[PDB]
Amino acid sequence: AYAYMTIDIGGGNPSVEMALNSDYEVIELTPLNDEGQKVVNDIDDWEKTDFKKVIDDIITDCSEHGYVKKSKEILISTVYENTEDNTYKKAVKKQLNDVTEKYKTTYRMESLESDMQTREKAKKEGVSTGSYIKS
């Protein structure tokens, strides 16, 4: 994969990791807890889909399951495999700003950037990268 996006919904409920390719499309969708598993099993046609649309489906599905309401928190973290592809990184941060701007009035959005090294420590703890910097 080119990069890994995690989304953690609420103060501590569904947790998923998106693996993305060079075209910013979601190629892997990994639940990290049981609530994240119900979400992923409801999301339809996410393979090769632009990650901004998959975020839309995840947040909609979390709201419909009762995991988010207005003014609640959404935490996104991004890890890059190729630390030296700054062009890719700039494009993701641009697209993440489009995502957070779209939701700034409904949810409190937090977008963090981490690294593989931290992601492996989070994986050894069985939790999302994002939830690990918050731990």
Side-chain angles (χ1 to χ4, degrees):
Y2 226 91
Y4 302 92
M5 225 159 276
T6 72
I7 189 157
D8 287 283
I9 286 272
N13 244 338
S15 178
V16 331
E17 178 176 83
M18 272 165 318
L20 324 167
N21 65 16
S22 65
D23 290 350
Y24 320 93
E25 302 166 338
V26 178
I27 58 156
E28 218 55 66
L29 200 59
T30 301
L32 305 167
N33 54 27
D34 289 317
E35 298 83 344
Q37 168 108 75
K38 316 192 192 344
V39 192
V40 173
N41 294 332
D42 302 327
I43 290 331
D44 262 304
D45 180 20
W46 57 259
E47 337 201 326
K48 296 206 74 293
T49 298
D50 174 78
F51 82 92
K52 294 180 316 286
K53 198 254 178 298
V54 181
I55 287 176
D56 291 335
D57 295 342
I58 287 171
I59 291 168
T60 298
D61 200 80
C62 285
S63 167
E64 293 188 344
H65 280 290
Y67 300 138
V68 278
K69 338 191 307 293
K70 135 88 163 143
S71 74
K72 293 263 160 285
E73 265 164 22
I74 294 180
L75 172 69
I76 298 169
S77 99
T78 308
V79 170
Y80 300 96
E81 286 223 338
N82 204 316
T83 205
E84 277 217 59
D85 194 338
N86 192 47
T87 302
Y88 191 85
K89 304 167 100 114
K90 296 191 284 188
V92 171
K93 315 294 155 173
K94 193 269 165 172
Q95 277 170 86
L96 282 172
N97 177 81
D98 293 355
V99 168
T100 52
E101 286 310 293
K102 164 157 120 132
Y103 287 110
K104 78 204 278 144
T105 51
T106 323
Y107 310 95
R108 326 209 271 121
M109 304 280 300
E110 193 186 357
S111 181
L112 268 38
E113 173 184 338
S114 211
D115 46 53
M116 296 306 291
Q117 291 80 38
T118 293
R119 173 173 182 270
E120 315 334 302
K121 316 206 271 213
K123 192 199 272 293
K124 172 204 314 153
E125 311 262 32
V127 316
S128 82
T129 303
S131 54
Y132 179 95
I133 311 78
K134 301 320 254 183
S135 299

